[PDB]
Amino acid sequence: ALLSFERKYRVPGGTLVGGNLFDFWVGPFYVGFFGVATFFFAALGIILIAWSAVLQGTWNPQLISVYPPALEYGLGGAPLAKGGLWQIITICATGAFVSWALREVEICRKLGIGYHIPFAFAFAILAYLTLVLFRPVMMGAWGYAFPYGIWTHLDWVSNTGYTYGNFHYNPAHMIAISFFFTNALALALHGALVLSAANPEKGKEMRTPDHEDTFFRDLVGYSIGTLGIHRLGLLLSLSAVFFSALCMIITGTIWFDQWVDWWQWWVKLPWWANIPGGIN
Amino acid sequence: AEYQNIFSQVQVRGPADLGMTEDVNLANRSGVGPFSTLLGWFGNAQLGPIYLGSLGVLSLFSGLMWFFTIGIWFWYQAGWNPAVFLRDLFFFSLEPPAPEYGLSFAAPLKEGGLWLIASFFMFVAVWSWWGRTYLRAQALGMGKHTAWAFLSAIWLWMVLGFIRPILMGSWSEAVPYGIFSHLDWTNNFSLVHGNLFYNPFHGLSIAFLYGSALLFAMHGATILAVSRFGGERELEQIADRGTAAERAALFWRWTMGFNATMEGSHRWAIWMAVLVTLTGGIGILLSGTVVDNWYVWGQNH
Amino acid sequence: DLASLAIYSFWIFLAGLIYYLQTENMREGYPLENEDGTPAANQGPFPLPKPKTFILPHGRGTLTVPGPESEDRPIALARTAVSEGFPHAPTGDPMKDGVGPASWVARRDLPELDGHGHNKIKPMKAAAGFHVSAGKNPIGLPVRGCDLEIAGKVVDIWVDIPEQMARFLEVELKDGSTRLLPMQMVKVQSNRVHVNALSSDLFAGIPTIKSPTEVTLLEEDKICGYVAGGLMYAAPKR
Ligand code: BCL
Ligand code: BCL
Ligand code: BCL
Ligand SMILES: CC[C@H]1c2cc3[nH]c4c(c3C)C(=O)[C@H](C(=O)OC)c4c3nc(cc4[nH]c(cc(n2)[C@@H]1C)c(C(C)=O)c4C)[C@@H](C)[C@@H]3CCC(=O)OC/C=C(\C)CCC[C@@H](C)CCC[C@@H](C)CCCC(C)C
Ligand SMILES: [Fe+3]
């Protein structure tokens, strides 16, 4: 039921809504008001999916899929079986994500820590909302949103990208990929540093942050520092998801032609446009 | 405005830190570089010293010999004209030898031999640097984690440029050196193999790539949230658990019903990231050597 | 077929990895306990790992985990409900008693040492060559708590020597005694330092340190503990 040092923290207080009404745990799990919110929204959502299942016709998870209203419905409702179930599941998902965060805030207040986790989570929620609400709204239809199925959402990724040619040429999608890759770089590095300090050569004693700084300076002439690295992971992470939302918010809205062609602005600059030679 | 530990409010500076001496040969460490106040708001202000032994110079040199090779070629392709160079920078490309030459080193300089030269320079740059990775750690008596993890990155790179081209019988199968062209290469590789979305190793690899952003967001945020109890002093929190590590475990355990240890979290971390390139490289390595078409392969697993 | 051999092997290797990882992460806080300290019945499907031993570097000893677990300290709370899973009410003043978000751990009563075996953290005044290099120097600023009353004045900064970073402000009280505030819980502005966690009357309550030129891990916990706790517990006076 409890970790060996847990009791002293399990105190009353922290809640954002309802005072002591939902102030309790179930096994390891805290339970906000927002614990109840997330259960309700999630369970409803799941039921609606087990359901949308039987109306499309399966009980197999690689097949089950739930599509948004088709393009013709615009921004309006749609019969349950013809995409409104999706509309409602979306409301339910948003329901559960935002609650999960707010629940996180409550756990933070109880533990007396900072809000950095739920804040970070919020960037993920905003990426999702970009795909299922902000992009589709600015575009006229729930039909541009992606559908809920393990393999079908990949179909969507692929149709949406190839509609603009090779999606690589989306410049914001380029910044975003840099961030993902750099993040995974920093994550491998961070993990291996700390671990190579705590599990040194063998029979040898634990190294120190000075060793960690020293190792990095030896290797590359610089070392960000144990505070820095954690400031950096966070930034690299969130930046990646930020530019992800940017690269799709702008696609189908301010830019809708072949992304490759956008680069023509650079090459067509007066001082070098007409000069001959090179690739162009 | 409750404060967040994202930027330092006050920087503090002391005598330059020349670092720990362990079995390191101090003869090869430079002297300290300058102190960047800019850097200093976010992390450490100190630049250097850097250690540059013989293997370091080798790496830094062939490395520098990998980047002028591509660059003279890019400059040729520009017809020596500097405004063209800038204009067409992302367009230039150093392509490998055509399929006719298989694995032969014969192909003319201007039409594939330069590719091989740059590739050669790159090969010795990367492996010598890998050595550097292990050796700086040995001299410090530290574990070999960094080198093992770096090996995982090397795997993908090895497989794309070297192992896969060999197994497929030609250098034409390898990746060009250009910004746009390596992107084209990538899209085309997918098209020709029946769409990498059907490659289960591609999926795994995405899973860990996204997973890395998830974990590092979690981790970074967690450490910053308990930085009011010294949480970033992770090594000592490993040796003698404080309230920082307790309050962090317990946010996760109240949130999602299970948690990490200060040390453990770093194991999740090293593995999450490493598995991106581990799975990725396998997936590429099997493409065209064993599976011509992931769709097709998928229809039978 | 070789590629379905590869993917099958991988799922197996990945299951073994999650196993290794999850058990690695049980070297603290396990075995699980009931709210009263006794070993719980459902320990979960993962067994504890075989012990490992870190060698500590400055004659400072060993750590071996998993190992016998204990708070090594009284926990002034009592149950508020008749079954598992509810809050435990503070039986006293929770700030004073070190519970809730005012909790501290019974870490070692010595200081963290750098790689050279010196104290990791010193007040700047005894840190050779150390000075503020950028941003508003807090030293001499009045310190203001959340009641908007002045609780004292900054008299130095304690610095992490090897990482060259501010870790605490040393603050003086009407008294003439000082306390450490954690650097991360203060806002340095141009005419004051603002502390939202604590109200002017709670400063004297901040746990004090035994020597004026060093802090032990145990003392850092009590201090950090205490000021974070004020965000919940000073909220009436805020
Ligand atoms: C053929 C396809 C096209 C292409 C078309 C697209 C399209 C189309 C899109 C991307 C997007 C992305 N592409 Mg691209 N892309 C291509 C090639 C690449 C390559 C490559 C190596 O070549 C890379 C590295 C990338 C990388 C990327 C990223 C920048 C981004 C995906 C991450 C993201 O947004 O997450 C943010 C994270 C989320 C959205 C997840 C949100 C999680 C929510 C909040 C909570 C979920 C809770 C869950 C339900 C609970 C389950 C229960 C528990 C598990 C128990 N693309 C090719 C050229 N790419 C996407 C993007 O930018 O999105 C904004 C996008 O739409
Ligand atoms: C981000 C840009 C694109 C996108 C592009 C891709 C691509 C490209 C790929 C995936 C893949 C995945 N995507 Mg997707 N995906 C998108 C948005 C989502 C959303 C969402 C709520 O926004 C979810 C929940 C998922 C979920 C998934 C998983 C089924 C799979 C592995 C993800 C992962 O490990 O991430 C990191 C997260 C973790 C490691 C945490 C664990 C999360 C678990 C595994 C998610 C379980 C979801 C469950 C199956 C569905 C929820 C049902 C519940 C009962 C309600 N994607 C958008 C539309 N996604 C990969 C795949 O292999 O698909 C077959 C793949 O190649
Ligand atoms: C249309 C394009 C295709 C596609 C084709 C490919 C191809 C082809 C490949 C990938 C690969 C990947 N793709 Mg895919 N990809 C697509 C769609 C996606 C989508 C999506 C639809 O949203 C996503 C999220 C991804 C994501 C990914 C990554 C998980 C994976 C690369 C891992 C990595 O870290 O690489 C980056 C890491 C490296 C390149 C290793 C770098 C190591 C070397 C040693 C560094 C040398 C540095 C050198 C010295 C120069 C540096 C200079 C310095 C400043 C000093 N792809 C579509 C279907 N994708 C790779 C993979 O593994 O596939 C299975 C790959 O080969
Ligand atoms: C912003 C940086 C990155 C990030 C950060 C991040 N994620 C987070 C957090 C943070 C900081 C948490 O605190 C939180 C957490 O608790 O993690 C363990 C979380 C989380 N991120 C998660 C997943 C996730 N994050 C992703 C990505 C990212 N997360 C970014 C890369 C992805 C990707 C890349 O695909 C996924 C899949 C969860 C593990 C967790 C949130 C758990 C949660 O909100 O629980 C509430 C809801 C449910 C338990 C039930 C399901 C909801 C129902 C309404 C039905 C299903 C909806 C439908 C959309 C299904 C879609 C089907 C798919 C096939 C497409
Ligand atoms: Fe860490």
Domain ranges of chain A: 1-163, 164-263
Answer whether A34 contacts ligand 4 (Cβ < 6 A): no
The 10 Å CB-count burial string (b at 16+, else e) for A170-208 is bbbbbbbbebbebbbbbbbbbbbbbbbbbbbeeeebbbb
Record the tokens describing residue B287, joined without a space: 């493409």
Contacts with C41 (C-beta within 8 Å, 6 or more apart), sequence order: none
H/E run at residue B116: helix B113-140
Paired with A25 in beta bridges are A30
Cβ B114 vs Cβ B94: under 8 Å: yes
Considering all CA atoms of chain A, what is the largest pairwise distance in Å, rounded to the nearest integer? 76
In single-letter form, the type of residue at position C149 comes to E
Residue nearest atom 44 in ligand 4 by C-alpha distance = A97
3-class DSSP state of A109? helix
Domain A164-263 part of CATH 2.40.50.320? no
How far out from the chain centre does Cα B114 lie? 25
Cα A253 from Cα B115, distance rounded (Å): 41
3-class DSSP state of A255? strand
Q: Is B252 annotated as a binding residue?
A: yes
Cα C152 from Cα A100, distance rounded (Å): 41
Paired with B94 in beta bridges are B177
Question: Quick one: which of B126, B273, B24, C60 has its CA closest to A195?
Answer: B273
In the 3-class helix/strand/coil scheme, how is B5-31 assigned residue by residue? CCCCCCEEECCCCCCCCCCCCHHHECC
Task: Tell me the CA–centroid distance for residue B252 and ligand 4, in Å.
Answer: 14
Domains annotated for chain B, with CATH where assigned, are 1-143 (1.20.85.10), 144-301 (1.20.85.10)
Rounded to a whole number of angstroms, the CA Rg of chain B reads: 24
Q: How far apart are the first and last CA of chain A?
A: 69
CATH topology of domain A1-163: Photosynthetic Reaction Center, subunit M; domain 1 (1.20.85)
Record the tokens describing residue B300, joined without a space: 């039978």
The ranges assigned to domains in chain C are 1-106, 107-238
Record the tokens describing residue C67, joined without a space: 């190992």
C204 sits in the region (left: phi over 0; alpha: psi -120 to 50; else beta) called alpha
Cα A38 from Cα A101, distance rounded (Å): 9
The DSSP secondary-structure symbol of A202 reads: S
Residue nearest atom 44 in ligand 2 by C-alpha distance = B207
Residue that is written with structure tokens 């010595």 in the block: C110
Which of C20, C28, C56, C70 would best serve as a mutation to test chain B binding (most B beta carbons within 10 A)? C28
CATH class of C107-238: alpha beta
Task: Tell me the CA–centroid distance for residue A212 and ligand 2, in Å.
Answer: 35
H/E run at residue A136: helix A135-139
Contacts with C12 (C-beta within 8 Å, 6 or more apart), sequence order: none
Question: Quick one: which of C170, C204, C202, C201 has its CA closest to C186?
Answer: C170
Cα A245 from Cα A241, distance rounded (Å): 6
3-class DSSP state of A198? helix
Looking at beta carbons, which pairs linking C91-95 to residues 24 or more positions away fall under 8 Å?
C94/A11, C94/C229, C94/C233, C95/C202, C95/C205, C95/C226, C95/C229, C95/C230, C95/C233
Task: Tell me the CA–centroid distance for residue A121 and ligand 4, in Å.
Answer: 8
Task: Give whole-number Cα distances, B36 to A218, B47, B244, C128, in Å.
Answer: 18, 7, 30, 21
Question: Quick one: which of A189, A196, B286, B93 has its CA closest to C9?
Answer: B286
Looking at beta carbons, which pairs linking C31-35 to residues 24 or more positions away fall under 8 Å?
C31/A4, C31/C69, C32/A1, C32/A2, C32/A3, C32/A4, C33/A1, C33/A2, C33/A3, C33/A4, C33/A6, C34/A1, C34/A2, C34/C84, C35/A1, C35/A2, C35/A7, C35/A10, C35/C79, C35/C84, C35/C88
The DSSP secondary-structure symbol of B4 reads: -
Contact A191 B79 (CB under 8 A): no
Chain breaks in chain A (C to N over 2.5 A) after: none
CATH topology of domain C1-106: Photosynthetic Reaction Center; Chain H, domain 1 (4.10.540)
- Residues from chain B contacting residue A272 (CB–CB below 8 Å): 83-84, 86-87
Contact C27 B13 (CB under 8 A): no
Number of Cβ within a 10 Å radius of residue C173 = 16
Q: Which of A111, A114, A188 sits opposite B250 (nearest CB)?
A: A111
Cβ B40 vs Cβ C187: under 8 Å: no
Burial of A254 (C-beta count, 10 Å sphere; 0-12/13-18/19+): exposed
In single-letter form, the type of residue at position A216 comes to F
Task: Give whole-number Cα distances, B297 to B190, B199, B201, in Å.
Answer: 14, 9, 13
Contacts with B61 (C-beta within 8 Å, 6 or more apart), sequence order: none
Q: Is A173 annotated as a binding residue?
A: yes
Cα A251 from Cα B86, distance rounded (Å): 27
Record the tokens describing residue A135, joined without a space: 């992009």
Method: X-ray
Record the tokens describing residue B120, joined without a space: 């050669």
Cβ A184 vs Cβ B152: under 8 Å: no
- Residues from chain A contacting residue B261 (CB–CB below 8 Å): none
Bridge-based pairing of strands C62-65 and A24-26 is: unpaired
DSSP state string for A27-59: TTEEE-HHHHHHHHHHHHHHHHHHHHHHHHT--
- Residues from chain C contacting residue A209 (CB–CB below 8 Å): 115, 162-163
